Write a protein that binds this ligand. Structure first.
Ligand code: HEM
Ligand SMILES: [Cl-]
Ligand SMILES: [Cl-]
Ligand SMILES: [Cl-]
Ligand SMILES: [Cl-]
Ligand SMILES: [Cl-]
Length: 152
């Protein structure tokens, strides 16, 4: 279920995210590369990337756009961490294009973990981060299951 963050937890999340926020596209490029390299079955889900070696696409416009738009969503979730409806709406809006896609919970959760590992958070910040990400996945998966309207 969705579980709100305290004011103090919101601050922890903003602080945890600050290094990424200040280098959003650069972080996105690295994290998205590391994700596709560690979990190679996922590159095929991206039609613009499909059929080419990862090291050939990593430097391309198409690749950087995809990595950017993932991180722009998380950046907007963080922006909205103190507004549950606003946070939910960010997710609701990005969920529609994923609904029909053959992407497993495993794949999404693997990306969550690459992001986590990259942040090297202490346990206080990591706890707050995981509250937010648990909310993120709650909403996202509700929307993938066609129960997106409950957040409206
Ligand atoms: C969980 C965090 C994620 C976020 C915040 C996110 C965000 C986005 C955004 C903003 C769009 C752009 C709208 C569009 O052109 O359709 C998009 C589309 C798409 N995403 Fe995601 N995504 C996430 C995870 C994933 C994963 C893990 C995969 C595949 C393994 C994936 C595959 C796709 C595909 C294939 C598209 C449709 C556009 C395209 O064909 O690239 N997404 N996503
Ligand atoms: Cl894989
Ligand atoms: Cl490859
Ligand atoms: Cl994506
Ligand atoms: Cl607010
Ligand atoms: Cl930390």
């Amino acid at each position: 279920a969705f579980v709100g963050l305290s004011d103090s937890e919101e601050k922890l999340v903003r602080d945890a995210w600050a290094p990424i926020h200040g280098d959003l596209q650069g972080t996105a490029n690295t994290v998205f590369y590391n994700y596709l390299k560690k979990y190679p079955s996922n590159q095929d889900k991206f039609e613009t990337l499909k059929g080419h070696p990862l090291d050939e696409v990593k430097d391309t416009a198409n690749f950087k756009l995809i990595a950017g738009r993932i991180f722009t969503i998380f950046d907007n979730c963080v922006k909205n961490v103190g507004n549950d409806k606003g946070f939910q709406k960010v997710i609701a809006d990005m969920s529609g294009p994923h609904v029909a896609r053959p992407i497993t919970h495993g794949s999404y959760n693997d990306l969550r973990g690459v992001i986590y590992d990259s942040m090297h958070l202490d346990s206080t910040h990591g706890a707050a981060w995981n509250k937010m990400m648990d909310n993120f996945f709650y909403v996202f998966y509700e929307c993938l299951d066609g129960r997106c309207s409950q957040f409206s």
